[PDB]
Amino acid sequence: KKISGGSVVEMQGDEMTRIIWELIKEKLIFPYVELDLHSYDLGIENRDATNDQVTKDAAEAIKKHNVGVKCATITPDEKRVEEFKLKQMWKSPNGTIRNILGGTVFREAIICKNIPRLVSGWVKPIIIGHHAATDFVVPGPGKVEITYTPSDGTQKVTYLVHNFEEGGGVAMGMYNQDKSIEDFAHSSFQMALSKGWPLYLSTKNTILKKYDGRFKDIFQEIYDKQYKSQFEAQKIWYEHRLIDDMVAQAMKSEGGFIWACKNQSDSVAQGYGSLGMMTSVLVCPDGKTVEAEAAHGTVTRHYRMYQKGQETSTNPIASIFAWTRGLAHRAKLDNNKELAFFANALEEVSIETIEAGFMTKDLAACIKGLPNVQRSDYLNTFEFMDKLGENLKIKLAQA
Amino acid sequence: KKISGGSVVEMQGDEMTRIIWELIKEKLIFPYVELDLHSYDLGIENRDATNDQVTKDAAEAIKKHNVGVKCATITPDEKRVEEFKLKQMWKSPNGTIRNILGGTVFREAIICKNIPRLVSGWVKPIIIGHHADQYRATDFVVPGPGKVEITYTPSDGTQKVTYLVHNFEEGGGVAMGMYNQDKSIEDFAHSSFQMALSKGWPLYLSTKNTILKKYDGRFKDIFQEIYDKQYKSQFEAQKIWYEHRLIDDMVAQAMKSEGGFIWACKNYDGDVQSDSVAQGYGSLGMMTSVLVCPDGKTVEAEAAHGTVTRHYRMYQKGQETSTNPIASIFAWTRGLAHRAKLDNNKELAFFANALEEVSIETIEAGFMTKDLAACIKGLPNVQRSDYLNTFEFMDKLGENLKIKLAQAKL
Numbered sequence: 001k002k003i004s005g006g007s008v009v010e011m012q013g014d015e016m017t018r019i020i021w022e023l024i025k026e027k028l029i030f031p032y033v034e035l036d037l038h039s040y041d042l043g044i045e046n047r048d049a050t051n052d053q054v055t056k057d058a059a060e061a062i063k064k065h066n067v068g069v070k071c072a073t074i075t076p077d078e079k080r081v082e083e084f085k086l087k088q089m090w091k092s093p094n095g096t097i098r099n100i101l102g103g104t105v106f107r108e109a110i111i112c113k114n115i116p117r118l119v120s121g122w123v124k125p126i127i128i129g130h131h132a133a134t135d136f137v138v139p140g141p142g143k144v145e146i147t148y149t150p151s152d153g154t155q156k157v158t159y160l161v162h163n164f165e166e167g168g169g170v171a172m173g174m175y176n177q178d179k180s181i182e183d184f185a186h187s188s189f190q191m192a193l194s195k196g197w198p199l200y201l202s203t204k205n206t207i208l209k210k211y212d213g214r215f216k217d218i219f220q221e222i223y224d225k226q227y228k229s230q231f232e233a234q235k236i237w238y239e240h241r242l243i244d245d246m247v248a249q250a251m252k253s254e255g256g257f258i259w260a261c262k263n264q265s266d267s268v269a270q271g272y273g274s275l276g277m278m279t280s281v282l283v284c285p286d287g288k289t290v291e292a293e294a295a296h297g298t299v300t301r302h303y304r305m306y307q308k309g310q311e312t313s314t315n316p317i318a319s320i321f322a323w324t325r326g327l328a329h330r331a332k333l334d335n336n337k338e339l340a341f342f343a344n345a346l347e348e349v350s351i352e353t354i355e356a357g358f359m360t361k362d363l364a365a366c367i368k369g370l371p372n373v374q375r376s377d378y379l380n381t382f383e384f385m386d387k388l389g390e391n392l393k394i395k396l397a398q399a
Numbered sequence: 400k401k402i403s404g405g406s407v408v409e410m411q412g413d414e415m416t417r418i419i420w421e422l423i424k425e426k427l428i429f430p431y432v433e434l435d436l437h438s439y440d441l442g443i444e445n446r447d448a449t450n451d452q453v454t455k456d457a458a459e460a461i462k463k464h465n466v467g468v469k470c471a472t473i474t475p476d477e478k479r480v481e482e483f484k485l486k487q488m489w490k491s492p493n494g495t496i497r498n499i500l501g502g503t504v505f506r507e508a509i510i511c512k513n514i515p516r517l518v519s520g521w522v523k524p525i526i527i528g529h530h531a532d533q534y535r536a537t538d539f540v541v542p543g544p545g546k547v548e549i550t551y552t553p554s555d556g557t558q559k560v561t562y563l564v565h566n567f568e569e570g571g572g573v574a575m576g577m578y579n580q581d582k583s584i585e586d587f588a589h590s591s592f593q594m595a596l597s598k599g600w601p602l603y604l605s606t607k608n609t610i611l612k613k614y615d616g617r618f619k620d621i622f623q624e625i626y627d628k629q630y631k632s633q634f635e636a637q638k639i640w641y642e643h644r645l646i647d648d649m650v651a652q653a654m655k656s657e658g659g660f661i662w663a664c665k666n667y668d669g670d671v672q673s674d675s676v677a678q679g680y681g682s683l684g685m686m687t688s689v690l691v692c693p694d695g696k697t698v699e700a701e702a703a704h705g706t707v708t709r710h711y712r713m714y715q716k717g718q719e720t721s722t723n724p725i726a727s728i729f730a731w732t733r734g735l736a737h738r739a740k741l742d743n744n745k746e747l748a749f750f751a752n753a754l755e756e757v758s759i760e761t762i763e764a765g766f767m768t769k770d771l772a773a774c775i776k777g778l779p780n781v782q783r784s785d786y787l788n789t790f791e792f793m794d795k796l797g798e799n800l801k802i803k804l805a806q807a808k809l
């Protein structure tokens with residue numbers, strides 16, 4: 001008989017990840033967990049048919065139920081508008097969800113001992129969260145100034161940005177509200193306590209002494225009053241770092257830390273060919289609400305090959321870890337030891353399978369190099385899923 | 400009876416690099432090349448004793464003679480004035496020289512087969528370009544509610560234009576203004592296009608003009624309209640090209656590339672994205688930098704690292720050091736190669752190339768300093784039998800350079 005998993009918000013997506021998403025639910029989730037499943041179809045056609053209302057409804061559902069797991073979605077461009085005859089170029093579902101939920105996105109790579117790392121000393125995962133303007137054209141010579149006028153009008157400060165003396169150019173003003181900085185701190189501290197890992201904040205406060213110093217000051221202030229004892233209880237710590245020193249410290253580290261960045265990771269994973277092993281999680285500052293997803297997109301290029309009949313080796317691990325992280329967080333909110341056990345076991349099974357030599361083409365290329373990858377070096381998407389299912393069944397049986 | 404080098408402005412420096420610098424001239428340059436040297440001592444003693452006038456003097460000579468090579472110089476902080484009992488926390492000579500000559504700084508790592516690269520697919524060097532943007536920004540604290548505006552006031556008395564940045568309705572925060580000039584973007588473009596044709600590699604500019612449509616669009620439009628008019632004809636002769644890339648597309652593209660291209664970066668923190676990574680990876684001694692002025696003629700070449708203070712203390716205390724000179728050598732060779740380009744000096748162009756190849760081949764033959772041995776075996780895992788010290792390595796280079804030049808007379 002199956003585990004009671006509780007309230008989970010699920011969002012269905014597009015193209016290749018949609019296929020893998022259902023495979024995950026059929027093969028890996030539903031045979032072992034029963035869910036009070038709040039399910040929303042963020043497929044592109046249904047977003048068009050509902051005028052993006054389903055996107056907003058999914059976000060309020062995550063807000064209500066604290067656990068969202070999301071499949072990758074097409075963000076419409078002009079060519080997508082014609083492909084599906086869209087009513088309009090709908091806004092990114094991801095931007096809509098985070099706008100409604102707030103919080104900070106943290107990315108984490110999944111490490112297998114048989115898989116090379118970009119920096120080989122990184123033997124434990126590193127978790128990175130980023131904090132997330134008015135620009136214009138200067139037609140010609142003249143002063144660009146930026147002014148602050150307090151609501152009392154008691155004073156007024158006019159800062160010189162630049163006096164253009166030879167021709168024109170460009171200029172911009174940008175800002176941050178304290179509250180958004182504070183939320184960034186709380187999410188970062190909540191992430192470190194949840195993971196049991198130390199936390200570092202990197203800034204350029206040597207250069208942006210006021211702008212970035214505010215990030216350092218608000219992080220330290222919130223830490224001292226609200227998290228320092230909770231950190232000491234888990235024997236973790238928080239420290240600010242100049243970005244220069246953080247880069248060097250990280251490259252000489254073995255991993256296992258949170259890195260809050262004040263200035264993204266998925267582009268480096270894509271260059272390295274490890275996007276299928278990179279998970280993503282949006283952490284709201286309340287410490288209660290989480291939205292988990294893969295860091296990659298719908299993998300359109302693999303989906304076209306699948307549509308034309310050709311065989312596909314798309315990596316499902318990041319999509320799988322979206323479910324494990326969501327369910328693990330659901331278990332923590334509910335004190336569900338059986339669900340917590342299942343979520344961890346599925347992560348172990350995923351890593352053990354790869355470390356036993358059964359992997360998708362991307363992983364094999366990471367070991368050998370793609371110009372040396374023969375077809376027997378890897379499994380296709382569906383073989384790999386079957387293999388994970390066999391190994392998951394065994395792991396759960398052997399207990 | 401030697402190779403005629405021509406007019407080169409030199410800039411002497413501080414501590415371990417200065418020691419390296421002299422070995423390079425005595426062992427690698429002077430025995431084969433005679434130069435119209437214009438030497439300036441930017442050692443911090445001579446900067447103090449001349450009230451840092453030698454620094455500004457050295458810059459104009461570069462503008463006069465168009466080729467300069469610079470040894471690493473101490474930047475004065477509050478702790479240096481106590482060590483050197485200085486009379487001022489002078490500017491770093493780098494910022495002085497740069498704002499005088501202007502132009503774009505290009506970074507290039509020196510690649511050896513047996514020395515691993517951060518991305519193994521990189522078999523050819525990648526050159527990063529960036530104008531010499533967060534450093535010229537005005538930031539401040541918003542202490543409480545109120546309005547932040549950014550305004551443009553024309554110098555001809557016409558109507559000022561006001562842009563709202565943000566209305567802080569409750570609480571405060573931070574705000575800042577940034578800027579870039581068309582003239583600097585235009586120099587950036589020309590310097591990049593001229594670097595690509597000189598090296599014979601394609602060129603990419605990366606912006607995020609999807610987000611900063613006006614700020615970064617100006618970068619993209621200016622590069623494109625200079626390319627379409629003044630360089631696309633030359634670019635297609637050498638089978639190369641220029642193209643704009645979104646920054647996140649470009650990161651992935653560069654990591655999948657084999658190297659051998661020029662990357663012009665709008666938002667570039669060179670101390671972070673280049674030096675710090677090389678510092679963490681352990682290859683700062685293999686990183687070179689050259690300032691390319693927009694005139695198409697004036698360059699200043701230098702190592703991308705500093706005076707290596709830690710090694711110098713070890714050398715002062717009597718201990719053996721193993722300091723990598725390659726980046727300092729390639730400051731010379733890149734300056735000489737540019738001098739030969741201007742003077743059509745085949746004999747000097749050959750010497751610069753030969754010195755670059757002897758440096759690379761010596762390492763690929765297994766003779767290297769401590770840092771390069773660490774890149775192979777791991778930073779904490781070097782034995783003394785794995786490397787040569789500073790002077791042992793310079794001797795090995797000198798011996799291989801003599802043999803290389805002898806075999807060239809056939």
Ligand SMILES: NC(=O)C1=CN([C@@H]2O[C@H](COP(=O)(O)OP(=O)(O)OC[C@H]3O[C@@H](n4cnc5c(N)ncnc54)[C@H](OP(=O)(O)O)[C@@H]3O)[C@@H](O)[C@H]2O)C=CC1
Binds near residue numbers: 071075270314316
């Ligand atoms: N959070 C979200 O919902 C996101 C959605 N998208 C959307 O996805 C669509 C396609 O985006 P695209 O630019 O192709 O980015 P994708 O991440 O979808 O694909 C980029 C490339 O990375 C590799 N890759 C990505 N995921 C995997 C995987 N699971 N297994 C193996 N390889 C993988 C593939 O490279 P190779 O070709 O070398 O195999 C793929 O072609 C777009 O419409 C975009 O809007 C994009 C990002 C995020």
Ligand SMILES: NC(=O)C1=CN([C@@H]2O[C@H](COP(=O)(O)OP(=O)(O)OC[C@H]3O[C@@H](n4cnc5c(N)ncnc54)[C@H](OP(=O)(O)O)[C@@H]3O)[C@@H](O)[C@H]2O)C=CC1
Binds near residue numbers: 726
């Ligand atoms: N262009 C210029 O004039 C610059 C000057 N400086 C100046 O140099 C001084 C020291 O700066 P610092 O922070 O030490 O920067 P350095 O580049 O001098 O040293 C940084 C570290 O990187 C390694 N390293 C650097 N160069 C080499 C090399 N050629 N061979 C082997 N290893 C190398 C050393 O690591 P390890 O200790 O592990 O051996 C060194 O401690 C300061 O006074 C600063 O102002 C700094 C930057 C630029």
Ligand SMILES: Cc1cc([C@H](C)Nc2nccc(N3C(=O)OC[C@@H]3[C@H](C)F)n2)ncc1-c1ccnc(C(F)(F)F)c1
Binds near residue numbers: 107109111122128272
């Ligand atoms: C530290 C870090 C970690 C991660 C991911 C989220 N976490 C992680 N954890 C363990 C391994 C690992 N990765 C690996 O080994 O290769 C692929 C993937 C990685 C994409 F490279 N990624 N993303 C970027 C950085 C990073 C950001 C800025 N600067 C640097 C540097 F200083 F190094 F330049 C590194």
Ligand SMILES: Cc1cc([C@H](C)Nc2nccc(N3C(=O)OC[C@@H]3[C@H](C)F)n2)ncc1-c1ccnc(C(F)(F)F)c1
Binds near residue numbers: 672
């Ligand atoms: C160190 C670094 C920092 C930055 C920017 C100015 N600052 C920053 N600070 C923190 C994180 C962060 N990045 C993140 O998280 O992902 C995207 C971006 C980064 C692409 F990683 N970028 N740009 C490039 C590099 C870099 C240069 C060469 N090699 C690598 C690597 F080794 F990673 F391949 C990384």
Ligand SMILES: Cc1cc([C@H](C)Nc2nccc(N3C(=O)OC[C@@H]3[C@H](C)F)n2)ncc1-c1ccnc(C(F)(F)F)c1
Binds near residue numbers: 673
């Ligand atoms: C492409 C690149 C090249 C260089 C240097 C001037 N050129 C170079 N050429 C060959 C090898 C080589 N390096 C190597 O092998 O290790 C150390 C050093 C490098 C520091 F990694 N550096 N600096 C930074 C980047 C870069 C900048 C921003 N973003 C990324 C990335 F997209 F990767 F994140 C990479």
